[PDB]
PDB file of C-alpha atoms and ligand atoms in Angstrom:
ATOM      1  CA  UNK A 271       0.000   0.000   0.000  1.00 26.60           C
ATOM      2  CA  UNK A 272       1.314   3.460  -1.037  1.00 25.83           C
ATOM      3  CA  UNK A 273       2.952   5.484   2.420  1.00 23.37           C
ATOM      4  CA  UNK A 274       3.158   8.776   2.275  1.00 25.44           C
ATOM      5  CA  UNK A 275       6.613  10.584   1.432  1.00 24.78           C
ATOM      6  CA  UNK A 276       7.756  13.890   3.984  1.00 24.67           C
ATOM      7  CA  UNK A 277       8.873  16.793   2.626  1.00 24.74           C
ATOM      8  CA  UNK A 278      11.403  19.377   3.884  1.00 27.25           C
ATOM      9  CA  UNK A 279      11.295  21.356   6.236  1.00 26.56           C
ATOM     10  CA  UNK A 280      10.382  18.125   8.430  1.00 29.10           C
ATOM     11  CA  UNK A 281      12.796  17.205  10.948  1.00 29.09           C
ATOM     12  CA  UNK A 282      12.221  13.785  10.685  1.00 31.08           C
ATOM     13  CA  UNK A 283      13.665  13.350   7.674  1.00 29.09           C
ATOM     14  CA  UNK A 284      16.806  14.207   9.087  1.00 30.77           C
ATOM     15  CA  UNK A 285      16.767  11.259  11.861  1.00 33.98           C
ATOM     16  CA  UNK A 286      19.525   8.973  11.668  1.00 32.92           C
ATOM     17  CA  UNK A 287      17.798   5.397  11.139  1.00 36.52           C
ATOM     18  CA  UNK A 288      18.813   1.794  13.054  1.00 33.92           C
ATOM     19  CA  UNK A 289      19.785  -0.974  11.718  1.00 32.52           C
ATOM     20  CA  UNK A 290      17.309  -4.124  11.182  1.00 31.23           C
ATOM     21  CA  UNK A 291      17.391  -6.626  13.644  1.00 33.02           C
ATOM     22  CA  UNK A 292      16.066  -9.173  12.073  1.00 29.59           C
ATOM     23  CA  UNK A 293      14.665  -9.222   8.345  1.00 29.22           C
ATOM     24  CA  UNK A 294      11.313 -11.426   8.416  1.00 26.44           C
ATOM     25  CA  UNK A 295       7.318 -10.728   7.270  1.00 26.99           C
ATOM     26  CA  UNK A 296       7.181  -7.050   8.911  1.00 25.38           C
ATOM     27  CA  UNK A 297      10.392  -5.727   7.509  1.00 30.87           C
ATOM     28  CA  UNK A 298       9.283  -7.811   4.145  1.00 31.70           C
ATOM     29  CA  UNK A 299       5.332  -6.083   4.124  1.00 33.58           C
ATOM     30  CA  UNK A 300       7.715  -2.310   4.606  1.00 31.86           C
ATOM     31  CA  UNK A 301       9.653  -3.606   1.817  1.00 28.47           C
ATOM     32  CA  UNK A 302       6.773  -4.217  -0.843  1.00 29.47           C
ATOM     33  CA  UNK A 303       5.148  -0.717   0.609  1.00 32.40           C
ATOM     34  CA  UNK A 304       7.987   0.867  -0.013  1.00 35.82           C
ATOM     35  CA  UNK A 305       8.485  -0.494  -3.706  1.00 33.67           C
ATOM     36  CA  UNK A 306       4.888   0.375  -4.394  1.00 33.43           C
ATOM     37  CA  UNK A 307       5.480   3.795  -2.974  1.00 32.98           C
ATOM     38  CA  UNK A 308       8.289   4.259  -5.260  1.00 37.49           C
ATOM     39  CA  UNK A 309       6.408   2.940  -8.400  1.00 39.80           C
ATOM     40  CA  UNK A 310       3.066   5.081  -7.598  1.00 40.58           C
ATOM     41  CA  UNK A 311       5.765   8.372  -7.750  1.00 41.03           C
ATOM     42  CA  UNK A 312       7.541   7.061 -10.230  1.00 43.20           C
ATOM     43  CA  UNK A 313      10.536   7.525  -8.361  1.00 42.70           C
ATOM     44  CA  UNK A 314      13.979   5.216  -8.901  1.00 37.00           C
ATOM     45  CA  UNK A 315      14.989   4.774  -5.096  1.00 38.00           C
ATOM     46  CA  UNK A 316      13.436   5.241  -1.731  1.00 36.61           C
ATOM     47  CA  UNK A 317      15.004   4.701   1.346  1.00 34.99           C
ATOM     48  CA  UNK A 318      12.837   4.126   4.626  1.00 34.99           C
ATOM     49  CA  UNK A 319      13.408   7.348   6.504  1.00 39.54           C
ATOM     50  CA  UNK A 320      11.518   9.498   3.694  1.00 40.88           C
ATOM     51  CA  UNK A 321       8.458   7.196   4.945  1.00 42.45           C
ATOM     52  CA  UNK A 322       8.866   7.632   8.147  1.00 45.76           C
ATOM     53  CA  UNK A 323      10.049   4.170   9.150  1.00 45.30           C
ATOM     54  CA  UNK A 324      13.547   4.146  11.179  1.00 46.96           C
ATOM     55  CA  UNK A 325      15.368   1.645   9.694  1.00 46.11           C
ATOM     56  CA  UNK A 326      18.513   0.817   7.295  1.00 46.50           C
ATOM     57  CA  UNK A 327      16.252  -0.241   4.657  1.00 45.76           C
ATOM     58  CA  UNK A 328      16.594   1.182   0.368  1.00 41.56           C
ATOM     59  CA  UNK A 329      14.661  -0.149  -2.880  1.00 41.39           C
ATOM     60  CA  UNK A 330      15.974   0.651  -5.933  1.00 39.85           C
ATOM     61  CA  UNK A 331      14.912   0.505  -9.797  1.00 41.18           C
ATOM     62  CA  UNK A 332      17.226   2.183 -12.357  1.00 39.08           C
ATOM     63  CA  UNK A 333      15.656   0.132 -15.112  1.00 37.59           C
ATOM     64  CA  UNK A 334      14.204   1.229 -18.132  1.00 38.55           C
ATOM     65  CA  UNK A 335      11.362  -1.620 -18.052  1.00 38.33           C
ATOM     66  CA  UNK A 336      11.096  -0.758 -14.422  1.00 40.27           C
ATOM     67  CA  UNK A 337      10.509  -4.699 -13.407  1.00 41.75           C
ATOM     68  CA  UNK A 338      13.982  -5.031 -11.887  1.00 41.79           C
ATOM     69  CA  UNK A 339      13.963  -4.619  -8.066  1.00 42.05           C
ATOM     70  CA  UNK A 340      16.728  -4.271  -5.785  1.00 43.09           C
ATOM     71  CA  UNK A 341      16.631  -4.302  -2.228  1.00 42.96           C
ATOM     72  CA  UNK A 342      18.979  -2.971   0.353  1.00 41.36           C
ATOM     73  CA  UNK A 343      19.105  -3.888   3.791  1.00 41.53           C
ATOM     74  CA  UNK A 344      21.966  -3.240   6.605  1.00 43.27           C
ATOM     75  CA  UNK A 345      24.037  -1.213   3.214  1.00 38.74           C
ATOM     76  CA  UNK A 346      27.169  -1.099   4.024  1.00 41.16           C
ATOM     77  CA  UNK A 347      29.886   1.055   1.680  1.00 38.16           C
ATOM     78  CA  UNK A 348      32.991  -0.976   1.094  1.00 37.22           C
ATOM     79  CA  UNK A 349      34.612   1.126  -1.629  1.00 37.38           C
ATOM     80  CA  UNK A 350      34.041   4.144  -3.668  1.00 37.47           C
ATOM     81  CA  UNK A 351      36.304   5.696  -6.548  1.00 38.86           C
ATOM     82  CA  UNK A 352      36.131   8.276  -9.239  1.00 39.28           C
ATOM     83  CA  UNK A 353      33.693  11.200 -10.057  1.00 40.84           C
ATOM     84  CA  UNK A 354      30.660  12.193 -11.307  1.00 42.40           C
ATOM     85  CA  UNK A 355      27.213  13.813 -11.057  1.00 40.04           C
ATOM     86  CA  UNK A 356      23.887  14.718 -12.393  1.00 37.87           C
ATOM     87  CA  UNK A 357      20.477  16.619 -11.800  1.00 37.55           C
ATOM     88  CA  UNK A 358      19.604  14.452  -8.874  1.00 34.78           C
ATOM     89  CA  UNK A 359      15.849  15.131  -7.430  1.00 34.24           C
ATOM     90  CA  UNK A 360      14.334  13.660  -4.214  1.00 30.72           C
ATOM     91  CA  UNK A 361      10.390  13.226  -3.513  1.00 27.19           C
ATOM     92  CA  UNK A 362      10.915  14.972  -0.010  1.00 28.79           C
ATOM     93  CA  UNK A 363      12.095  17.965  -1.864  1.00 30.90           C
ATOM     94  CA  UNK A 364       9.463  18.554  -4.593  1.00 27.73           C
ATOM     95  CA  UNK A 365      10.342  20.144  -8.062  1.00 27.52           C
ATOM     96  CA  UNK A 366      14.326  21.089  -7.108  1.00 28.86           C
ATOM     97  CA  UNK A 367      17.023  19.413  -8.681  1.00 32.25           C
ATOM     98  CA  UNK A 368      20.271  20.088  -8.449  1.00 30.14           C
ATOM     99  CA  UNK A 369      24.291  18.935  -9.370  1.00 30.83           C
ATOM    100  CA  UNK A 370      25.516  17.111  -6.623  1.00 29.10           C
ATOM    101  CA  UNK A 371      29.346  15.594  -6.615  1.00 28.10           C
ATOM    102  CA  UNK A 372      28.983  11.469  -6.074  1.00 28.35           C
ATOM    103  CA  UNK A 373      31.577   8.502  -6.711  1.00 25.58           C
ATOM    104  CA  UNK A 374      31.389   6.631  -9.960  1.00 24.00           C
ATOM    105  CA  UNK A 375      32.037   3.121  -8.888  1.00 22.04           C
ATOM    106  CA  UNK A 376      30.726   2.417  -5.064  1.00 21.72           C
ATOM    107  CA  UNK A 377      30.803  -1.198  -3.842  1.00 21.42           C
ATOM    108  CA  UNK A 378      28.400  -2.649  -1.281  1.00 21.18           C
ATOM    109  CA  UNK A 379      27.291  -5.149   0.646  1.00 19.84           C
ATOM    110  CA  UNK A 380      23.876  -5.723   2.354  1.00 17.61           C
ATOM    111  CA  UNK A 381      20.933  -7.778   3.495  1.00 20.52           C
ATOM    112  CA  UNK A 382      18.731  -8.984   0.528  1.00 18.87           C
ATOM    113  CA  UNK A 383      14.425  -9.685   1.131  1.00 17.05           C
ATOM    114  CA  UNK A 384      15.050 -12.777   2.484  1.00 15.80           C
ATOM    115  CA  UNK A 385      17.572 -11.360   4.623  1.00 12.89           C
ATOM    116  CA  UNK A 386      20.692 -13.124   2.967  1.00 13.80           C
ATOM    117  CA  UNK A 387      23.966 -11.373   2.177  1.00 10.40           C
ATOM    118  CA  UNK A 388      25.603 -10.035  -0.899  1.00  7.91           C
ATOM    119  CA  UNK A 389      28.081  -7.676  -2.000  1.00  7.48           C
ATOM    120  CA  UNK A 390      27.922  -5.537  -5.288  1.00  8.96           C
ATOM    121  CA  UNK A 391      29.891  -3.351  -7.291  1.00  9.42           C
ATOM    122  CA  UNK A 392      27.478  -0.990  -8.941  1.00  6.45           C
ATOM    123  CA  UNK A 393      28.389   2.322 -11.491  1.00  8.62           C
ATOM    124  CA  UNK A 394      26.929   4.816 -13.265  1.00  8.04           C
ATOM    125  CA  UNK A 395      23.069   5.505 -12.077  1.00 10.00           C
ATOM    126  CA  UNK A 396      22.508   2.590  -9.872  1.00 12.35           C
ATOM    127  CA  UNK A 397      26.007   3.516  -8.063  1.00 11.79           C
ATOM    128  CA  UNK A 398      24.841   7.355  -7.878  1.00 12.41           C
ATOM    129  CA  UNK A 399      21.463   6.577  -6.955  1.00 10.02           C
ATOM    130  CA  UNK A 400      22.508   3.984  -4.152  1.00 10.56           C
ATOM    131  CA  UNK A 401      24.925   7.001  -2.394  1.00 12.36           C
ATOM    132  CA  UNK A 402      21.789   9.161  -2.631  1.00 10.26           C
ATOM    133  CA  UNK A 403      19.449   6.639  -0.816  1.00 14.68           C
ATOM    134  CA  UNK A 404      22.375   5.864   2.222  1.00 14.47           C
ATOM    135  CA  UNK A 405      22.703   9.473   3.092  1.00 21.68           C
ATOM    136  CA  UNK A 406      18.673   9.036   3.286  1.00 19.86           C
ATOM    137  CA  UNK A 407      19.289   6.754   6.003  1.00 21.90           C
ATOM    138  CA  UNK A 408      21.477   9.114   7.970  1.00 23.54           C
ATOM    139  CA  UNK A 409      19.537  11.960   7.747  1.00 26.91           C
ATOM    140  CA  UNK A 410      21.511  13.872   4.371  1.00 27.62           C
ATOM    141  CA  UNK A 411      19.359  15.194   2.232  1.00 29.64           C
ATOM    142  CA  UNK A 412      20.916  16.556  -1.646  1.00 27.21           C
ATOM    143  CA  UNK A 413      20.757  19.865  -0.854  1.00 29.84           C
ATOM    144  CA  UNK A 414      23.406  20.049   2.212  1.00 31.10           C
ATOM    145  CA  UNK A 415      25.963  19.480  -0.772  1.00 30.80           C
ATOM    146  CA  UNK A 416      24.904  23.314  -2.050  1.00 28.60           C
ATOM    147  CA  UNK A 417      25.962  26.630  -0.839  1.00 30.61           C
ATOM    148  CA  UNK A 418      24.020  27.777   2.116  1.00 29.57           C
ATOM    149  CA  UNK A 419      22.584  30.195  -0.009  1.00 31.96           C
ATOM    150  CA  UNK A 420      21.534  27.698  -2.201  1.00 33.18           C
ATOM    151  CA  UNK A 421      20.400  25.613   0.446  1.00 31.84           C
ATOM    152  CA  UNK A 422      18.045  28.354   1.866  1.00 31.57           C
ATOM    153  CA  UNK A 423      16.461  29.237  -1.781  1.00 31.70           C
ATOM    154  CA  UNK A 424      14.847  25.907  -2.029  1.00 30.65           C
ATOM    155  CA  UNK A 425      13.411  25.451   1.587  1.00 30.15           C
ATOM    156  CA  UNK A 426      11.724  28.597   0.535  1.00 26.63           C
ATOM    157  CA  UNK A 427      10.296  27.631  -2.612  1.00 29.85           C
ATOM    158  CA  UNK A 428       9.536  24.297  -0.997  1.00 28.95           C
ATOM    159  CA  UNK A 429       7.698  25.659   1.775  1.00 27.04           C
ATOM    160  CA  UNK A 430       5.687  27.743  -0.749  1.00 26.18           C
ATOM    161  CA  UNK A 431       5.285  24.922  -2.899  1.00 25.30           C
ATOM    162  CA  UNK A 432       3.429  23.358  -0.279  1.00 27.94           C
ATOM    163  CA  UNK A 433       1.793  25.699   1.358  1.00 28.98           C
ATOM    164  CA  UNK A 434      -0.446  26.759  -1.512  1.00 30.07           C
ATOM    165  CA  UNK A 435      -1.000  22.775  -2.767  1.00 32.14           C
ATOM    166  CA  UNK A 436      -2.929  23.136   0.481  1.00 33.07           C
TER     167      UNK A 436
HETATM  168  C1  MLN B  45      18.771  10.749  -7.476  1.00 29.14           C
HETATM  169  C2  MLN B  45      18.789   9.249  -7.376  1.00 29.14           C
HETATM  170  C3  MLN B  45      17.317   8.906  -7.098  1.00 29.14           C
HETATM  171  C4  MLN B  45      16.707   9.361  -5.810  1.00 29.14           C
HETATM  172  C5  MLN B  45      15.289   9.972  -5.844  1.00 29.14           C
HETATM  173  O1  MLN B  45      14.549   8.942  -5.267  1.00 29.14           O
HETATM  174  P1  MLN B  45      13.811   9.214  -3.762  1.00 29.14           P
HETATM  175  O2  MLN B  45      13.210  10.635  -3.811  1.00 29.14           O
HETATM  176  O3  MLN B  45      15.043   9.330  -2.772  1.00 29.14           O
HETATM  177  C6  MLN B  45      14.578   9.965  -7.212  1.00 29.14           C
HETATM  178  O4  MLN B  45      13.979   8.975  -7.606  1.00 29.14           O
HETATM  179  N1  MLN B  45      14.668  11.131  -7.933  1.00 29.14           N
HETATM  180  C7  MLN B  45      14.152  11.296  -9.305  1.00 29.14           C
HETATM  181  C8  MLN B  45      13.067  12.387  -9.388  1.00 29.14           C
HETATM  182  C9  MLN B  45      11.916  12.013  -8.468  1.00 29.14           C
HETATM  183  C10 MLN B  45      11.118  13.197  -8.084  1.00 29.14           C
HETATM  184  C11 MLN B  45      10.811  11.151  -8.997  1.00 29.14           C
HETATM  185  C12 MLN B  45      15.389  11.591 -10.155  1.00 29.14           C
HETATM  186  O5  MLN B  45      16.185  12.494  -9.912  1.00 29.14           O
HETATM  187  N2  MLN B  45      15.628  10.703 -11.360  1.00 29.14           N
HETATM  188  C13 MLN B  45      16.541  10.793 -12.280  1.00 29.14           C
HETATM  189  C14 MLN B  45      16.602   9.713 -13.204  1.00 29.14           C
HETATM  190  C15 MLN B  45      17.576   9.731 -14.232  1.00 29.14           C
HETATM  191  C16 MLN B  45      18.429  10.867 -14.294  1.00 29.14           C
HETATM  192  N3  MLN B  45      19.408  10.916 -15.327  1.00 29.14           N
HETATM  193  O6  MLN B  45      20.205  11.981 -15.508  1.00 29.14           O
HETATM  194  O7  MLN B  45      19.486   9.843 -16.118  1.00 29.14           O
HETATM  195  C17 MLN B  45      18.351  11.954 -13.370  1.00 29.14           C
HETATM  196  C18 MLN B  45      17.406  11.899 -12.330  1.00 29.14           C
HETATM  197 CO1   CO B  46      15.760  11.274  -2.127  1.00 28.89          CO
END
């Protein structure tokens, strides 16, 4: 069932999750709410603290036939090289996008659905996308990589943004 994404200014988003316990049918039923979350906004990640559920869990789906899940539980950042970037967007921080600095190559390891192990060496989007979701889960949000001024810009056209869709 589709939760219901924060938006900045909400301090919450900024609350540094725990790690899961123990993966079994709860942490599985947030897992397939959070994928259908991210479908219904069409989004390509979503990490559990944009839901407000406080815990280490991402989906991701940087396919084009978008049918090709991937599920991230416990991450864990092994290594990270190189440089790159693009016009990165978040659904807590509606119609903003911005250039933020990220690592080419990342590898990973985490907790899969059923809770089993793996490690992966990811690049280009899913690599990009995958340090965007983490800093989810300890509170970063895109826009603390921008000039203050910057920064401030967008909370206000956020917080206008929202206030009149109300
Ligand atoms: C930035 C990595 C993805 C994280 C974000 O997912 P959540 O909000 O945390 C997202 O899905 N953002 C979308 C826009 C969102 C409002 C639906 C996004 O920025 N997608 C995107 C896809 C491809 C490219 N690209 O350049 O190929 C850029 C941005
Ligand atoms: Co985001």
């Amino acid at each position: 069932s589709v939760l219901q994404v924060l938006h900045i200014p909400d301090e919450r988003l900024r609350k540094v999750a725990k790690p899961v316990e123990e993966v079994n049918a709860e942490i599985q039923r947030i897992v397939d709410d959070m994928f259908e979350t991210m479908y219904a906004e069409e989004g390509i990640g979503l990490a559990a603290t944009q839901v407000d559920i406080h815990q280490r869990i991402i989906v991701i789906d940087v396919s084009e036939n978008r049918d090709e899940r991937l599920v991230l539980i416990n991450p864990e950042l092994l290594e990270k090289s190189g440089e790159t970037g693009i016009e990165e967007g978040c659904l807590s921080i509606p119609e903003q996008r911005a250039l933020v600095p990220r690592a080419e190559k990342v590898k990973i390891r985490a907790l899969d659905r059923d809770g089993k192990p793996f490690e992966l060496e990811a690049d280009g989007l899913l690599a990009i996308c995958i340090q965007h979701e983490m800093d989810h889960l300890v509170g970063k949000l895109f826009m603390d990589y921008l000039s203050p001024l910057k920064q401030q810009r967008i909370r206000q056209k956020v917080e206008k943004l929202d206030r009149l869709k109300a």
